[PDB]
Structure formats: C-alpha cells, structure tokens
Design an enzyme around this catalytic site. Structure first.
Site, PDB file in Angstrom:
ATOM      1  N   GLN A 116      21.681 -34.782  -5.434  1.00 17.97           N
ATOM      2  CA  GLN A 116      22.568 -34.975  -6.579  1.00 17.97           C
ATOM      3  C   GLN A 116      23.880 -34.217  -6.414  1.00 17.97           C
ATOM      4  OE1 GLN A 116      21.424 -35.849 -10.895  1.00 17.97           O
ATOM      5  NE2 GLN A 116      19.744 -34.483 -10.336  1.00 17.97           N
ATOM      6  N   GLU A 117      24.958 -34.748  -7.031  1.00 15.44           N
ATOM      7  CA  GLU A 117      26.308 -34.166  -7.128  1.00 15.44           C
ATOM      8  C   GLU A 117      26.933 -33.704  -5.798  1.00 15.44           C
ATOM      9  OE1 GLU A 117      28.508 -32.503  -9.815  1.00 15.44           O
ATOM     10  OE2 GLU A 117      27.717 -33.648 -11.520  1.00 15.44           O
ATOM     11  N   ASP A 118      27.246 -34.661  -4.903  1.00 18.78           N
ATOM     12  CA  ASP A 118      27.890 -34.384  -3.607  1.00 18.78           C
ATOM     13  C   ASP A 118      27.084 -33.360  -2.707  1.00 18.78           C
ATOM     14  OD1 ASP A 118      30.737 -35.521  -2.486  1.00 18.78           O
ATOM     15  OD2 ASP A 118      30.834 -35.651  -4.679  1.00 18.78           O
ATOM     16  N   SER A 119      25.735 -33.481  -2.710  1.00 17.56           N
ATOM     17  CA  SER A 119      24.804 -32.756  -1.832  1.00 17.56           C
ATOM     18  C   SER A 119      23.929 -33.835  -1.147  1.00 17.56           C
ATOM     19  CB  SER A 119      23.997 -31.694  -2.582  1.00 17.56           C
ATOM     20  OG  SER A 119      23.013 -32.201  -3.468  1.00 17.56           O
TER      21      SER A 119
END
Ligand SMILES: [Zn+2]
Ligand SMILES: [Zn+2]
Ligand SMILES: [Zn+2]
Lengths: 114, 46, 266, 65, 134
Positions: E2-5
C-alpha cells in the site's frame, strides 16, 4: 540486519511446543490452537478437512502477522465431542487421503515408459 | 618464496620492508597492492 | 483406485503433467506449496576460499556455488547438520567438494560444475554429485578466467529446504489450473466486448465439457480436477518431487497427531 | 556480469544454457526467439533471464592482471 | 504494498534478484611535520600516553594495514598510524562504525612529495531488504 534467522520459519525455539490449546471463552465447546513454526501449507488443509466433519459447528484459521510462522485454528463442535478429537480425526483423514494419492501416483508412474 | 606486496602493471610479487623504496623490482613503478591473508575466509552459499 | 486418483498425461526426466481428480482444492494446493518450499535437497552452504584471482568477488562466486544443483536422490541417508552430533560437520551430515581452476590456456579458461570433485566419503549413497544436463556435459558455468587468474576453494554441501534459501528448491515452476470453462464463477472475466472471445482458451478446455448457454448456474458444484505440471531442477527426479511432496506433507499432518498425543501425557 | 545460475522467478537452471544460446545464434544463425525455445526456455520469466542478460565478464577479463 | 511501497519475491531475492555490491575507499598519508619528524604506519600498542582507538588493532599486520582477505567490522582499525610529540600518539583509521564487510584491496604507493600513501577498499554485498528503495 534487523532480519530474523531464515530457519526460525520452521525450527521450534526454546520451550516452543508445536501446539498450544486454549479454550474459547466466547463460545461453548470451542477451542483455539496455536500452531508454532507453520503456515497455510498446513492451516488451510486442516481447516478444509475439519469443515468436512458433520459434528464440526465452526472451523477457521488466521495468520495474525506475516513476520511470524504461526497460526491460530478455532474449532467449535457439537456437544459431547472434543474438538481435539475432531482435529485428531481430521488429521488421519488427510494422511489416509495422501497415502492413497501416493500409491495411485506410484501406480500411474510405473505405467509410464518415457 | 615470501608474499607481502604485488605490482599493479607487471604484477611481480615484491615483498619489501618498512622503508625499503615503494618502487617495483623490474619496472620502476610506484603502484603496489597488498598480499591477501593466508587466513582462509569463509562465506555462506546464500 | 482408493480416494483421490491421479491421471498422468505426459512424462519426462524433467516434467510430469498430470490430472489430480477426486481431491479438495486446499489439498492440491498444499501439495503444490510443499513441492516447492519443504522438500529437502543438498546444496553447497559453506564456501571457504583459499585463493581468488578472478574478476568476480569472493561472495559472488560463493552465491553461485549454492545455486548449482547437486544430487539428492538418497538425501534421507544424510543427516541435517543441526541434528548431527559432530562439531560443525561430518560425513554423516555433509558432502565436501573442492574447486581448483587456472588459466593455463592463452584463451579464456571456463569453470563449470563438472570441475567440482567430491572430497568427502559418500558411504555409497547417490548424493553430492553436481547435476549435469547439457549436451556438451559441462554443467553450470561458474566463471571465466584469464592467464594468472586462479581459483581454489572448498565447499560444504548440506541438507536443507526452500523455506531456508531457495537454493534447496527441488522444483522449478509448478503449473496449476482447474475449471477451464469458468463454470464455478471463481473469476469474473474483464472485457471490452466479448468475455469469451477476448480471453484465450486453455489446453485443459478439451478435457472438460463446455456448459451450453441453456444450462443454469450450478451452485452445488465444487472444485475438484486440477491440471498440474511439475518441473524438476535435477536434484531429485521429477516423480520423487511429487512422491516426496506427498510424503513430506504427510509427515507434517502426522507430526501434529504425534504432538497432540504428547499433550495427552500431562 | 556472468549468466545467472537459475531464473529468478521459478528457479529453472539457465546457467548451463549460455554457451549453447550463443552457438544457436552465431553458428546455427537462428533468431533469439527460436534459440531460447530450442534450449527449452518455455515461460517468459526464464526467457528474459538469457535474452536480456549482458555478459560483462568478457569485458572485465580484458584488463591485464 | 500500500501507498507507493511494494512486495518482493524472496525466492527471487535468494536466486540473486536486485542484489548489488558495495565498495568504500579509506585513505591515509605519512605527513611530515617540519624536518625528519614523520608519521609512521605500524600496528601501535600501549606505549606511554598514546590515545589509541577502542577498536581491534589485531586485524592490522606489521605494516599497519589489513591483509585484503580479512572480514572487518564495527570500529576495527583498518590503518594503523602514529604521530610523535616532544612518545607516540595514535593517528589510526577505524572502519565506519555504521558499516561492515571484507577487505577487498589495499594499495601502498608514494605521494608526489616522496612520502608513504595508502588506500584501503572494503567490499560488502547488499541484499534487497524490507526498507530498501526501488
Ligand atoms: Zn612492476
Ligand atoms: Zn556431522
Ligand atoms: Zn523462470
């Protein structure tokens, strides 16, 4: 560097037993078994066979966090039936099914010539 | 045979003492490299 | 005959294509998982480097040496170092291999898995032999040398599993499919015009009757019949990856009962 | 650097298959697509392993020591 | 992821995916304070009032350098040097505290002046870990 030992994934630690059986407070004739150094390889398989048992009222399993190889398996059974026995039976049922799958593969492999 | 230093260009085993001229025997080159321990190093095949 | 039946389609020294019928999905998958992750193999685990003149880093080569396939047919005869009683390793728990190469040719001199030689005693078991599969019979190319470029090192091969390092991966990709005609509605196919036209047909579509528009949705329908394809790296012959796969998965379920019985001692 | 032993994704041994992949292209004059296929690199995970690899080792060997 | 990982295949990482090498070069010289008063590359020891480092000097050879095979860590002394005062004061080079590896290459030459000059390169293999960028 802060990374665990790769082997911890399957090798029981100091005083770590493969199973820890605790009764579910929340429901009658229900249990929670903590399987240490294990995964869905075994968990999903045991749950599926537990679900085949008519006397099994509830069966589920969860892997609370992926960093640690362990799972909790919750078994609720009909009165006058130990969930331990439901799992005891559900296990034999897996082994016997697998023992048949081995022999019937060995039969089909011996039949092959390539 | 004694191993202390090696040359970079000609690569001739030199082996010289503290204050014994930093140049190389044969080619007059001042570039030198150290031995490598006889202390056999171990690694994990991972 | 009894319970879950297997129907082998194609067979080779490298690939086993079969149809697993009368099984529970979870079982077919759990075997799939075991086949990869938990079957024990032998691979190099300790590389003690004596001398290296290669353009390649010590550890780089060390890594590659692990990745090299080694014979595991009789892996059961070798103990896991961890449980052996020796100080570090012995003949009962390990296979010692020696690699010694040098650029005697003016041309580039190659280093291959055939260049390894077993220095430990094998006690007769087919273990520790580097797997060679190519026509020329050289095996895996470890590295390339020059002239004065020399490489001397010692290898300690040990029993292990993929859960530790995938170098003990007795299997390559395992193919797995069921219900090619999506009758079970397990997938909701993405489309722009026609669901069926856009999505390619499977090979296994031949081995299953199509539904015919006029038939209603079978909600009583359950997932059995799994088209699988195992691929041996070489360590253990393909058949034994399927067999040991079954055995390892059994040993596991059994170990639960064994420990459940020990709990009933207190 | 040098042909990796085994494909990253699935672990199929691509390490041995290098020299033969170079011969299939040079000597047999085959295309990069059929070469990988003849060698038995079925799924694209392994195909990329050899097809997209750069054998820099040859350039490092060129330097004198 | 999640979220640019992102999630990475460990079985791929094992096989050597996104794996990199790392090198760091540490450098030193025998400075000449005035005339005939020179610094000296050696393996120093407890001799009068030298302010020696808290690392392992034992990894150094007699020349005051590591042999290019040894595994170095923490603040292990990788260049042993001493400056005199009018006995000996420590002028050693430890490894970077926040680092560890294996000595890759030690280079002993001379500076344009005609004084001892040395460079030490240390190797480390870095493996894609949980907080690593891509
Ligand atoms: Zn020279
Ligand atoms: Zn032993
Ligand atoms: Zn692949």
């Amino acid at each position: 560097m802060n990374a665990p030992d790769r082997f911890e994934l399957f090798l029981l630690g100091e005083g770590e037993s493969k199973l820890k059986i605790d009764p579910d407070t929340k429901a009658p004739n229900a249990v929670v078994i903590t399987f240490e150094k294990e995964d869905h390889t075994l968990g999903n398989l045991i749950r599926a066979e537990l679900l085949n048992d008519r006397k099994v009222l509830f069966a589920a399993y969860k892997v609370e966090h992926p960093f640690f190889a362990r799972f909790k398996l919750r078994i609720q059974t009909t009165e006058g039936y130990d969930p331990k026995d439901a799992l005891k039976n559900a296990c034999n049922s897996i082994i016997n099914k697998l023992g048949a799958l081995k022999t019937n593969f060995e039969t089909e492999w011996n039949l092959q010539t390539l | 045979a004694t191993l202390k230093y090696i040359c970079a260009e000609c690569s001739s085993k030199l082996s010289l003492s503290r204050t014994d001229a930093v140049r190389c025997k044969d080619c007059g080159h001042r570039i030198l490299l150290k031995a490598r321990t006889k202390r056999l190093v171990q690694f994990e095949a991972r | 005959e009894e319970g879950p039946q297997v129907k082998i389609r194609e067979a080779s020294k490298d690939n086993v294509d079969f149809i697993l019928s009368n099984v529970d999905l979870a079982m077919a998958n759990s075997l799939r998982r075991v086949m990869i992750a938990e079957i024990p193999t032998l691979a190099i685990d300790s590389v003690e480097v004596e001398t290296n003149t290669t353009v390649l880093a010590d550890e780089f080569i060390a890594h590659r040496l692990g990745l090299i396939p080694l014979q595991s047919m009789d892996i059961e005869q070798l103990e896991y170092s961890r449980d052996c009683f020796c100080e570090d390793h012995c003949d009962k728990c390990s296979v010692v291999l020696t690699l010694q190469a040098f650029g005697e040719s003016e041309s580039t001199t190659n280093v291959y898995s055939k260049d390894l030689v077993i220095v430990s005693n094998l006690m007769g078991r087919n273990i520790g032999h580097p797997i060679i599969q190519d026509k020329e019979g050289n095996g895996v190319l470890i590295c390339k040398l020059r002239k004065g470029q020399e490489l001397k090192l010692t290898c300690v091969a040990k029993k292990g599993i993929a859960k530790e390092h995938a170098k003990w991966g007795p299997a390559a990709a395992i193919e797995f499919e069921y219900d090619p005609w999506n009758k079970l509605k397990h997938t909701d196919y993405w489309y722009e015009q026609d669901s069926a036209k856009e999505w390619p047909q499977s090979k296994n579509c031949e081995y299953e009757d199509p539904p015919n528009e006029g038939d209603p949705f079978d909600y009583k329908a359950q997932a059995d019949t799994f088209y699988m394809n195992v691929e041996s790296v070489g360590s253990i012959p393909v058949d034994q990856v399927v067999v040991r796969g079954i055995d390892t998965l059994q040993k596991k379920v059994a170990s639960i009962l064994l420990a459940l019985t020990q709990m009933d001692q207190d | 650097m040098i042909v990796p032993v085994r494909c990253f994704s699935c672990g199929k041994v691509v390490g041995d298959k290098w020299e033969s992949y170079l011969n299939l292209l040079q000597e047999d004059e085959l295309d990069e697509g059929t070469a990988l296929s003849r060698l038995g690199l079925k799924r694209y995970c392994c195909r990329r392993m050899i097809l997209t690899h750069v054998d820099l080792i040859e350039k490092f060997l060129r330097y004198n020591p | 992821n999640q979220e640019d990982s992102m999630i990475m295949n460990q079985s791929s990482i094992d096989r050597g995916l996104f794996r990199s090498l790392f090198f760091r070069s540490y450098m030193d010289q025998e400075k000449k304070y005035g005339m005939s008063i020179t610094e000296t590359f050696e393996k120093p020891q407890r001799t009068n009032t030298l302010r020696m480092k808290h690392g392992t000097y034992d990894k150094l050879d007699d020349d005051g350098l590591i042999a290019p095979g040894v595994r170095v860590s923490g603040e292990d002394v990788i260049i042993g040097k001493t400056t005199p005062i009018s006995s000996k004061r420590d002028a050693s080079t430890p490894l970077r505290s926040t680092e560890n590896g294996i000595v890759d290459q030690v280079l002993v030459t001379t500076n344009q002046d005609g004084l001892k000059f040395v460079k030490v390169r240390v190797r480390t293999t870095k493996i894609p870990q949980i907080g690593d960028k891509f």
